[PDB]
Amino acid sequence: TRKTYTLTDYLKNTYRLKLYSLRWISDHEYLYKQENNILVFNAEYGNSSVFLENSTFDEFGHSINDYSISPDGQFILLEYNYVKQWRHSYTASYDIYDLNKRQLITEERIPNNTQWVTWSPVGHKLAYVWNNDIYVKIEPNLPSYRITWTGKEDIIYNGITDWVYEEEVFSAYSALWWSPNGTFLAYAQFNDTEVPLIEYSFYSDESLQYPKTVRVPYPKAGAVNPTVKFFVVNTDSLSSVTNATSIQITAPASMLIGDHYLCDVTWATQERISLQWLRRIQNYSVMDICDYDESSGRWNCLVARQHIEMSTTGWVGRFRPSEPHFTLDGNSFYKIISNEEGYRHICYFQIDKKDCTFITKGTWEVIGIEALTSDYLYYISNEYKGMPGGRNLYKIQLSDYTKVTCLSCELNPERCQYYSVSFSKEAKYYQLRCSGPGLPLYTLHSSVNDKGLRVLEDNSALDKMLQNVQMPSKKLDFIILNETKFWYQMILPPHFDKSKKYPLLLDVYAGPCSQKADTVFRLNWATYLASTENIIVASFDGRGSGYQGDKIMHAINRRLGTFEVEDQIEAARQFSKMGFVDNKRIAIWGWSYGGYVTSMVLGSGSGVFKCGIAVAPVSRWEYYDSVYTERYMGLPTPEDNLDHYRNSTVMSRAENFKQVEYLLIHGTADDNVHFQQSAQISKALVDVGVDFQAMWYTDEDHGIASSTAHQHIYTHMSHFIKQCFSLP
Amino acid sequence: TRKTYTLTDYLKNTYRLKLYSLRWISDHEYLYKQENNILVFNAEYGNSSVFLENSTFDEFGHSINDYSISPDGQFILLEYNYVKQWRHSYTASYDIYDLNKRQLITEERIPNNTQWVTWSPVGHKLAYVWNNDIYVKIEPNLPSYRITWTGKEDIIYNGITDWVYEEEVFSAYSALWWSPNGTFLAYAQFNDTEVPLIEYSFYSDESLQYPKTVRVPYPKAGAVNPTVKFFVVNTDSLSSVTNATSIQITAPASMLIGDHYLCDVTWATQERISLQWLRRIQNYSVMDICDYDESSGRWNCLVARQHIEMSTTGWVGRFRPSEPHFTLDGNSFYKIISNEEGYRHICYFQIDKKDCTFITKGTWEVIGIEALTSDYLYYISNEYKGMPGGRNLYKIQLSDYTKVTCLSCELNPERCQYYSVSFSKEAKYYQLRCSGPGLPLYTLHSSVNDKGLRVLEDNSALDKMLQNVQMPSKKLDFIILNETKFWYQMILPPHFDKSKKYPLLLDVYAGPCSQKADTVFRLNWATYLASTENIIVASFDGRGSGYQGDKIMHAINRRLGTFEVEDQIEAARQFSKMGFVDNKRIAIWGWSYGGYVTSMVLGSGSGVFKCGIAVAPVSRWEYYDSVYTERYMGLPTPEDNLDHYRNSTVMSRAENFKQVEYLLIHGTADDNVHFQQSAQISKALVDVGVDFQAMWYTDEDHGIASSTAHQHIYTHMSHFIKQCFSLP
Numbered sequence A, B: 001t002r003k004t005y006t007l008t009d010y011l012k013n014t015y016r017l018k019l020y021s022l023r024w025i026s027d028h029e030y031l032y033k034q035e036n037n038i039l040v041f042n043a044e045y046g047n048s049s050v051f052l053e054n055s056t057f058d059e060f061g062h063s064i065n066d067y068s069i070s071p072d073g074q075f076i077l078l079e080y081n082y083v084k085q086w087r088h089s090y091t092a093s094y095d096i097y098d099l100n101k102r103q104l105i106t107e108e109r110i111p112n113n114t115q116w117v118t119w120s121p122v123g124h125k126l127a128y129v130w131n132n133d134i135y136v137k138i139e140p141n142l143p144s145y146r147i148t149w150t151g152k153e154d155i156i157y158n159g160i161t162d163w164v165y166e167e168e169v170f171s172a173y174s175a176l177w178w179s180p181n182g183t184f185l186a187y188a189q190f191n192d193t194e195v196p197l198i199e200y201s202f203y204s205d206e207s208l209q210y211p212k213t214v215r216v217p218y219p220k221a222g223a224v225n226p227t228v229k230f231f232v233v234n235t236d237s238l239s240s241v242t243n244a245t246s247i248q249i250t251a252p253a254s255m256l257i258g259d260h261y262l263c264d265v266t267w268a269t270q271e272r273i274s275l276q277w278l279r280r281i282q283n284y285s286v287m288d289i290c291d292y293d294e295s296s297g298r299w300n301c302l303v304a305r306q307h308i309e310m311s312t313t314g315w316v317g318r319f320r321p322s323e324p325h326f327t328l329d330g331n332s333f334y335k336i337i338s339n340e341e342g343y344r345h346i347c348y349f350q351i352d353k354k355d356c357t358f359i360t361k362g363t364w365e366v367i368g369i370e371a372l373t374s375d376y377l378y379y380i381s382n383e384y385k386g387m388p389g390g391r392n393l394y395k396i397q398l399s400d401y402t403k404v405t406c407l408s409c410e411l412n413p414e415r416c417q418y419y420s421v422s423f424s425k426e427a428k429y430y431q432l433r434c435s436g437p438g439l440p441l442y443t444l445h446s447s448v449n450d451k452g453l454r455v456l457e458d459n460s461a462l463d464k465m466l467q468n469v470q471m472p473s474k475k476l477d478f479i480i481l482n483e484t485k486f487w488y489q490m491i492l493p494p495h496f497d498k499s500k501k502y503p504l505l506l507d508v509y510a511g512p513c514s515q516k517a518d519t520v521f522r523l524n525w526a527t528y529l530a531s532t533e534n535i536i537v538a539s540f541d542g543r544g545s546g547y548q549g550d551k552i553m554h555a556i557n558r559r560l561g562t563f564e565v566e567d568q569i570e571a572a573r574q575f576s577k578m579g580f581v582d583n584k585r586i587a588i589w590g591w592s593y594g595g596y597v598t599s600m601v602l603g604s605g606s607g608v609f610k611c612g613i614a615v616a617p618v619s620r621w622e623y624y625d626s627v628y629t630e631r632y633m634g635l636p637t638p639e640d641n642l643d644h645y646r647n648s649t650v651m652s653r654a655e656n657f658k659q660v661e662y663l664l665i666h667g668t669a670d671d672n673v674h675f676q677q678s679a680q681i682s683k684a685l686v687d688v689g690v691d692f693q694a695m696w697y698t699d700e701d702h703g704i705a706s707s708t709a710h711q712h713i714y715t716h717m718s719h720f721i722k723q724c725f726s727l728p
């Protein structure tokens, strides 16, 4: 008999997916690493040369974590001494290498403890942030110009985000934005003076005698938020004036009446910038479009160019208002917004007209706009076959909206139903990346004729390996509840037999705009559970889930911990009725939001689930951060939504855990969902006399992603599931 | 078919030991609390009167925690609003009730949040500490005189101890000592300015949005220690208009040359005080004897009255240098010290002579001196039947040391082998307290002819209830290692059948001077495990254990985590070869020091133990406090004992946990053994890929003693042991 996909296979990566990560450096060349050499490829013909020999930095004396070539090709920025901070942020050292002199720059180096660095989009200017202030270098070997003087650790952040803006607003650490040709540098400044601190212990190596207390400005729901200001500096003036003026652009009056956020910054032209602002009550946003006034040196935002985006049924955007994509002249833009039926589609705006024109429509959604040329807009959607969990690339003719071509749908329809794309600098070529349901496939295409040029990586080596393995299958389908389709997937054991009763594990996330039923190919823990342990691993996208319109997504508005929890319970009941599930052996697990839902389900008293595992769960919404929580829950005040905040805790359900086996797991240095959240769950369970299993992971954060802890946690959870299901 | 002693019996206190806690108020009367009344008893005849009616405080408006009657009987101090701090420390509110005029005192009340209060030993003066400063009240209704003005939270402590002096030196929060008639008040002042702080999170009620960070001055091994000064104030010459003058008594030069401690304060007469000082290297101590000089108003300690106590094989004293017991005139004293054979015996000293005379001798030890008259000294020892785990009361004729009479040995030798005693004011009467091997027995005696006056409490009610329960028995015996006998006990299941094989749990503590093999009767977790689950629960006293001389106790000097760990393995090895032990089911558990030993044993690679449980273990001596750790280990410096600090950690043994099942448990608010210690164990186990079981207890301290956590931990451990032993 062929072997199975075992736990050790998962944990040791024996069966590896190959990727093809390229970096476009122009409209027709890309960089690609191969055998630690950086090669440069010609896209049209597929030929290559060595861009940088892998021997180049043998004598560097440090392992180089990443590199970044200046847009003009003249320099390479070398990143080393890399230390992770939060999801996106990190600390590192940097050196610059002159590619023409084939020489390292030893003068006026980027300092130690630099927080962020970026090249200008053209040429080779650098902007970096060090000790919370912005610096610009016009040339890599010359002195820096200081841009801000207010930077203060944990208090004032210039050009980088604080914790909550990084995690919840920008999905990025950087808070600066070069203008398209590099003349201007726009940046945000955050003031956390009165934001309360989360404090937790970090134990470090065993040599550390006293634990360190980590202290981070972190606004929990309803707490004082960071305030924000926006500035633009002319970097071309730096070498001519002693201290160049940062010109502030103020938020509109409709935002200044209360707490608000800066949520998007997008340059439209060399002298026009768009800013979107969001009210703390996140159902109202405003875009200003601001023009540089050459005679006054100021930036002015005409109210005739201001665009309002609001929601009557929920919050604005999927996780925030969408970004605009400006036409070359900057006088019009395209933006994904929810149409009158609640489906997200592409709308076309003139900058000084308030009514836009939808250029796509239907009962499906546009996921993202990927490229815009003078003649075509390229976008990704889930239109194809009415499958919300598929993704394909489309092209729409700007002179005639009835001409829409699917570029990816029929390329390999059995193997490939989930695409992303990477366009060259002026969209002359594109790389398609298919990620399922078959093995991933990376291909290169020419935009002039939409012809396939070549296969970049087809994963045939892996395909060969998997031939000798009893792999599970995946089923993606829907059930109908109240005349609405709700999608599910199942990872099914090899030789699945519909006449047998299998144990079922419900793998849950179920956060707002989540999607756990899709066409993506994964090699993960579920692969082992199905393949080796003969467990069915199911996931369900119920109310609150994304990419299916606002009626579904906004069903949980102001009501987290209700329908999305109920719909997972109902999903399990529906799976029992399918006839191949052992009703005595249904379990549930999740991480993060999934841990909250899992815990809520286990505490519901439904009687459906024998056991479950919550990893780093939210337990009480007042413990989680303001920006995410309030987006869905409003404010925890008597005037707003306090009663539901208080009604949706895990702790209030502690008595019902007497009916289940529960394993609670949390990293002690989780900066995101504080260990506090599980500390309060455990205390509530202790207080009502409920036995349960627990595991803390010393100095692990929300990812529990260190190599040893990752292997440990999946090993511990595997034991627990097997015990619950009486598997030897 | 009668019941067993169940887990719920242990957790719910079904079978209660009755006490007889009295408080002597004179040579012939004592107070006893009965049905919320306070009675006064006549010792000679056993008749009583009501001293204070329960009903007196019916409309008090607060729950009264405790009471303290002034020595002259005129006043009662009422303690309420009790808030626990560490092992001994707490704050509370106090009111004083006048017993003669039958009224609460409303003038000049003791403030809220008072840290310590005590009556003078004669009359009804009060001293109290509030906000770290000392106050004295001459009369309950009159204003306090402020004695100290330097008190500062976490920095300067007047009249109360800091964390480490409380836990490790004085076993008390108070650092006030009244002279015998109340004229003088001596006190210590602690200065923790440069002592580092342990910091840890406290989660509190679910309502608390942000966790609190608790910060406590706590010197870990080798860290900066608190400094100490000692003062005496005359309370008879206090003034309303002038600040009180405190006279300092400075430590001897032999102490002032480096770090040191104040370790004992004992008044000898109305005008003579003795102080003992201990070097930070705790093998050298000095007693000063200081006399009040009425013409200078100063305290002088003559060098000819200094007494040095040192140890060549270890540290001084069992846990600290022993207390002196002065004669009526204060010109001589008796003190327990280690003799030339290493056995602790009573030495008689003249205050101005260097050599003392031992008045007892032999291969057994004196446990404590209990009372002293002009004709007799009364002490407790383990001499009887050469059993180190038994305790009896003796008297020795001071005119003829060959005349020693056992006063408790033969009273009831089958029921009673472990005594303590409480003498009346001038030793005219004594209460004997038998705590095993039978049910506790409380009796009253008169010293003149050692008459056994009456039985105060015989627990005949409990005896009656226990007749209908299948109770375990206790075997106390010894094994011979390298020609030394070492004692053990086994809690044996009911109907013990030596032809059957029982699983065995080794219950371990094994700290320096510990004794876990004794004749004490206990109703505890082991009782349930033996009675209901048929597990033998054994304990063993090996090298490092107490009450058997320094050759045994000092064997672990400078070497914690060696012989005491080895000796537990050897005992289990020997138990495993007895015909009634199943060698496939041997487990080990312990708490605190016992958790360290358990962990070290399970990490030894001995293969003897299937599983074990460590509750709040020490894992690395550098993490524990200076005073305890350094007593046994010296300083963690390269020139002292650093190498041994470094190879005595649990973490270094992680790989050896591969072949055992381990459950690790720790309270997150443990101020004593910081959660840090277990956090480092878990990380080390994770790092070598060893699976284990864990449980944290939110906001529990070293005792894990709140009602709900206590029930939960023993429930969780019981499941673990039963699973390990395949018991239903």
Ligand SMILES: *[C@@H]1O[C@H](CO)[C@@H](O[C@@H]2O[C@H](CO)[C@@H](O)[C@H](O)[C@H]2NC(C)=O)[C@H](O)[C@H]1NC(C)=O
Residues within 6 Å of the ligand: A040, A041, A042, A045, A047, A048, A049
């Ligand atoms: C891929 O091949 C092309 C064409 O052969 C190379 O482009 C140049 O071709 C000219 C012919 O006029 C040669 O003289 C040079 O060798 C090439 N110049 C440069 C700057 O590349 C091209 O080099 C190849 N691309 C890569 C990345 O190697």
Ligand SMILES: *[C@@H]1O[C@H](CO)[C@@H](O[C@@H]2O[C@H](CO)[C@@H](O)[C@H](O)[C@H]2NC(C)=O)[C@H](O)[C@H]1NC(C)=O
Residues within 6 Å of the ligand: A150, A156, A191, A192, A193, A194
């Ligand atoms: C960040 O915000 C704080 C307000 O929270 C500002 O601090 C105030 O500044 C004024 C001076 O203009 C002082 O008079 C106030 O006392 C300060 N308030 C507090 C609460 O500290 C601070 O100026 C801001 N910093 C920047 C660079 O904008």
Ligand SMILES: *[C@@H]1O[C@H](CO)[C@@H](O[C@@H]2O[C@H](CO)[C@@H](O)[C@H](O)[C@H]2NC(C)=O)[C@H](O)[C@H]1NC(C)=O
Residues within 6 Å of the ligand: A149, A150, A243
């Ligand atoms: C460059 O200009 C900025 C803005 O005018 C200066 O920042 C001010 O500095 C002064 C005193 O050092 C403060 O009182 C102001 O509150 C600051 N304003 C801002 C916006 O930061 C900065 O100090 C100047 N740098 C130099 C070298 O002159």
Ligand SMILES: *[C@@H]1O[C@H](CO)[C@@H](O[C@@H]2O[C@H](CO)[C@@H](O)[C@H](O)[C@H]2NC(C)=O)[C@H](O)[C@H]1NC(C)=O
Residues within 6 Å of the ligand: A181, A182, A183, A234, A236, A270, A271
């Ligand atoms: C980048 O764009 C900027 C902004 O339009 C250009 O700067 C202007 O250049 C024109 C010259 O044609 C001048 O009249 C203006 O005074 C400049 N304005 C400012 C604010 O600097 C700039 O020339 C462009 N840079 C490059 C390299 O093409």
Ligand SMILES: *[C@@H]1O[C@H](CO)[C@@H](O[C@@H]2O[C@H](CO)[C@@H](O)[C@H](O)[C@H]2NC(C)=O)[C@H](O)[C@H]1NC(C)=O
Residues within 6 Å of the ligand: B150, B156, B191, B192, B193, B194
């Ligand atoms: C308690 O101890 C500290 C020393 O730790 C004494 O404080 C001062 O020590 C600093 C070092 O922190 C020196 O600057 C001074 O010499 C010390 N003070 C003085 C006045 O010299 C502190 O004074 C002590 N406090 C008490 C009340 O005894």
Ligand SMILES: *[C@@H]1O[C@H](CO)[C@@H](O[C@@H]2O[C@H](CO)[C@@H](O)[C@H](O)[C@H]2NC(C)=O)[C@H](O)[C@H]1NC(C)=O
Residues within 6 Å of the ligand: B181, B182, B183, B234, B236, B270, B271, B292, B294
């Ligand atoms: C407590 O003992 C003290 C100290 O011996 C006594 O105080 C002395 O009393 C006599 C009066 O007979 C004076 O001559 C001394 O000057 C006192 N000494 C001091 C230091 O005050 C005191 O009498 C005793 N107190 C009681 C209540 O008996």
Ligand SMILES: *[C@@H]1O[C@H](CO)[C@@H](O[C@@H]2O[C@H](CO)[C@@H](O)[C@H](O)[C@H]2NC(C)=O)[C@H](O)[C@H]1NC(C)=O
Residues within 6 Å of the ligand: B281, B283, B284, B310, B311, B312, B313, B634, B639, B640
């Ligand atoms: C108290 O203990 C210390 C530590 O064991 C003894 O220290 C001496 O100094 C170092 C150890 O730190 C060694 O080099 C010496 O050999 C130690 N002396 C010995 C072994 O005699 C110190 O001697 C002890 N004090 C007493 C009174 O015994």
Ligand SMILES: N[C@H]1C[C@@H](N2Cc3nn4cccnc4c3C2)CO[C@@H]1c1cc(F)ccc1F
Residues within 6 Å of the ligand: A167, A168, A171, A319, A320, A511, A592, A593, A618, A624, A628, A672, A673, A702
């Ligand atoms: N902090 C959130 C961010 C959330 N989003 C995913 C995502 N996809 N996406 C696409 C475009 C823009 N933004 C986003 C986000 C941000 C994922 O859950 C996180 C989270 C939620 C909890 F309740 C608890 C812990 C968490 F880590």
Ligand SMILES: N[C@H]1C[C@@H](N2Cc3nn4cccnc4c3C2)CO[C@@H]1c1cc(F)ccc1F
Residues within 6 Å of the ligand: B167, B168, B171, B319, B511, B592, B593, B618, B624, B628, B672, B673, B702
């Ligand atoms: N801090 C010590 C104190 C020690 N006690 C002191 C003391 N004085 N004393 C007088 C007569 C009889 N017994 C004692 C003891 C026992 C008990 O262990 C405690 C302990 C040891 C650890 F390794 C870890 C945590 C602990 F809490």
Ligand SMILES: *[C@@H]1O[C@H](CO)[C@@H](O)[C@H](O)[C@H]1NC(C)=O
Residues within 6 Å of the ligand: A281, A283, A284, A310, A311, A312, A313, A634
């Ligand atoms: C924004 O939300 C609040 C609370 O739900 C509501 O009162 C307000 O009307 C909303 N705004 C819009 C535009 O619907």
Ligand SMILES: *[C@@H]1O[C@H](CO)[C@@H](O)[C@H](O)[C@H]1NC(C)=O
Residues within 6 Å of the ligand: B040, B041, B042, B045, B047, B048, B049
């Ligand atoms: C007990 O009895 C004696 C003698 O009868 C009596 O005078 C004395 O006051 C009594 N003591 C108490 C405390 O009742």
Ligand SMILES: *[C@@H]1O[C@H](CO)[C@@H](O)[C@H](O)[C@H]1NC(C)=O
Residues within 6 Å of the ligand: B093, B109, B110, B111, B112
């Ligand atoms: C103790 O606190 C209570 C409650 O505020 C207050 O009424 C009382 O005056 C306080 N007692 C003293 C002695 O200050």
Ligand SMILES: *[C@@H]1O[C@H](CO)[C@@H](O)[C@H](O)[C@H]1NC(C)=O
Residues within 6 Å of the ligand: B149, B241, B242, B243
């Ligand atoms: C007593 O000492 C304190 C603190 O040094 C001072 O403030 C106070 O005024 C003094 N009182 C008298 C009466 O000297």
Ligand code: NA
Residues within 6 Å of the ligand: B452, B453, B454, B455
């Ligand atoms: Na009698």
